[PDB]
Amino acid sequence: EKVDNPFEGAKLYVNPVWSAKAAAEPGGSAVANESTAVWLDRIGAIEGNDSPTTGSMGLRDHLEEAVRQSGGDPLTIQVVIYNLPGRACAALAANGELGPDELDRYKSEYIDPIADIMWDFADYENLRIVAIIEIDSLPNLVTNVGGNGGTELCAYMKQNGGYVNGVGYALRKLGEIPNVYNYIDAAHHGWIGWDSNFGPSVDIFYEAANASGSTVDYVHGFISNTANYSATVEPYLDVNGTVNGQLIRQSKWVDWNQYVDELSFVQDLRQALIAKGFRSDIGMLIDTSRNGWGGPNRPTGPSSSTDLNTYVDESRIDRRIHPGNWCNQAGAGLGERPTVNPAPGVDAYVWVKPPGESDGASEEIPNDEGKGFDRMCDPTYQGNARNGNNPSGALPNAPISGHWFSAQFRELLANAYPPL
Numbered sequence: 009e010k011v012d013n014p015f016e017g018a019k020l021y022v023n024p025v026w027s028a029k030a031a032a033e034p035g036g037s038a039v040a041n042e043s044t045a046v047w048l049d050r051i052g053a054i055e056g057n058d059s060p061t062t063g064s065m066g067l068r069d070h071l072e073e074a075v076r077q078s079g080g081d082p083l084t085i086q087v088v089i090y091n092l093p094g095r096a097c098a099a100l101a102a103n104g105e106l107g108p109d110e111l112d113r114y115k116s117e118y119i120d121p122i123a124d125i126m127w128d129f130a131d132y133e134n135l136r137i138v139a140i141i142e143i144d145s146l147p148n149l150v151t152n153v154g155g156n157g158g159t160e161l162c163a164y165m166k167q168n169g170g171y172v173n174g175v176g177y178a179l180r181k182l183g184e185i186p187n188v189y190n191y192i193d194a195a196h197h198g199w200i201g202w203d204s205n206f207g208p209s210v211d212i213f214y215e216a217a218n219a220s221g222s223t224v225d226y227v228h229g230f231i232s233n234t235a236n237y238s239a240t241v242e243p244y245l246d247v248n249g250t251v252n253g254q255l256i257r258q259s260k261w262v263d264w265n266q267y268v269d270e271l272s273f274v275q276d277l278r279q280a281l282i283a284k285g286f287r288s289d290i291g292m293l294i295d296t297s298r299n300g301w302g303g304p305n306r307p308t309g310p311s312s313s314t315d316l317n318t319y320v321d322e323s324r325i326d327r328r329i330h331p332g333n334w335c336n337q338a339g340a341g342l343g344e345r346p347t348v349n350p351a352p353g354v355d356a357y358v359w360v361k362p363p364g365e366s367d368g369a370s371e372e373i374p375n376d377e378g379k380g381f382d383r384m385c386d387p388t389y390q391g392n393a394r395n396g397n398n399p400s401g402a403l404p405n406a407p408i409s410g411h412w413f414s415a416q417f418r419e420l421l422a423n424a425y426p427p428l
């Protein structure tokens with residue numbers, strides 16, 4: 009009874025809090041009426057906490073504003089569910105208020121009040137709520153547990169079931185509401201694109217969909233590239249191709265990945281998920297908030313070079329040093345503006361990470377948000393295992409994650425692709 013694609017035939021919510029911030033930047037009015045997802049990054053964001061990350065509007069305020077903007081007609085608002093116990097276990101930049109052992113509080117004081125408020129809007133037939141479920145969670149339990157270079161926190165979160173059970177609980181509690189459309193976060197190709205990660209990610213997504221009373225029927229789809237920068241399509245790069253003998257996969261950039269972009273990745277992932285037992289009518293989202301890679305540095309065509317790495321590095325639109333470089337990435341541009349069904353199996357391109365909001369502090373900044381200083385956000389950081397021992401590529405003088413980052417907004421705007 010829920011529509012096949014909640015983005016289809018709907019006006020998109022414009023967040024007034026985000027809109028004002030964009031509009032106050034030079035030239036920012038050009039994108040200030042774009043739809044971005046509303047993040048519930050703290051229990052305080054539910055009622056509203058006048059914070060640097062969520063401002064003066066609580067969830068009810070946003071849904072009232074969504075109803076107002078709708079004018080009676082179909083309108084879709086995206087709400088990011090983002091407060092798991094031991095949140096973001098592989099990193100420190102977006103750690104949260106709920107510790108590893110606080111699943112009970114996640115249920116009672118976070119998911120339950122959210123569900124309560126959403127139920128109050130169930131009488132608006134044309135309001136659609138897209139719930140984006142727990143970014144940067146489950147894939148960590150595949151790639152950051154055991155072996156070498158993992159974290160004890162991720163190991164613990166796998167052991168105690170907090171991520172799997174927390175996700176299943178969100179899926180059921182929100183999914184049983186008539187106008188709520190759940191999308192599970194699915195990392196990105198430069199995370200779980202490899203053979204060793206792909207299948208196990210599929211399995212853990214299925215496990216979470218069946219935890220805490222959930223079934224696959226509470227899952228409308230999956231989102232990739234959330235708050236990341238991976239290219240939607242690499243127009244001059246073929247993952248299966250070859251440069252003068254040497255395979256594309258042998259390049260430093262691709263490094264045996266099954267994929268070079270998000271589109272091929274989510275289309276294959278969609279098929280795997282259906283095969284695993286997810287509904288055949290699931291659809292994929294791609295966060296294109298920051299993946300346009302436009303401006304003067306954008307390749308205008310494939311390289312003429314016959315050397316493998318030279319060809320790949322000159323041909324790729326994603327210009328990062330390493331695909332594992334995730335924080336405040338230097339040179340990034342706004343990607344495709346939100347678009348309905350742009351490609352086979354894709355419900356929408358969307359702006360989930362709101363452009364101009366930081367990925368993390370570039371230094372030690374005191375806060376009550378539970379957020380530490382992650383060195384992957386430090387421009388001077390020389391890397392580790394999970395990035396091939398490379399410089400971080402992160403922008404200097406960055407504020408706490410979610411805080412307004414003028415310099416990043418301005419560069420994203422300048423590097424928009426397609427141009428504005």
Ligand SMILES: OC[C@H]1O[C@@H](O[C@H]2[C@H](O)[C@@H](O)[C@H](O[C@H]3[C@H](O)[C@@H](O)[C@H](O[C@H]4[C@H](O)[C@@H](O)[C@H](O)O[C@@H]4CO)O[C@@H]3CO)O[C@@H]2CO)[C@H](O)[C@@H](O)[C@@H]1O
Pocket residue numbers: 096098099101102144151152195196198199200202204205233234235236263264331332333334393394395396
């Ligand atoms: O997306 C925003 C989110 O990012 C989190 O960090 C993620 C990175 O986004 C992601 O690119 C990174 O992916 C790793 C992956 O975990 C490894 O399993 C994989 O290992 C490869 C290796 O690179 C190859 O040399 C080898 O041949 O194959 C193996 C696989 O078998 O490498 C990739 C790329 O580095 O994982 C990160 C998490 O650890 C942030 O933590 C978070 O803050 C952000 O919100």
Ligand SMILES: OC[C@H]1O[C@@H](O)[C@H](O)[C@@H](O)[C@@H]1O
Pocket residue numbers: 047048049061101102361362365366367368409410411
């Ligand atoms: O900007 C969107 C979100 O980004 C996350 O990395 C932060 O931790 C949140 O506070 C913020 O709401």
Ligand SMILES: [Ca+2]
Pocket residue numbers: 011012013228289290291
């Ligand atoms: Ca569908």
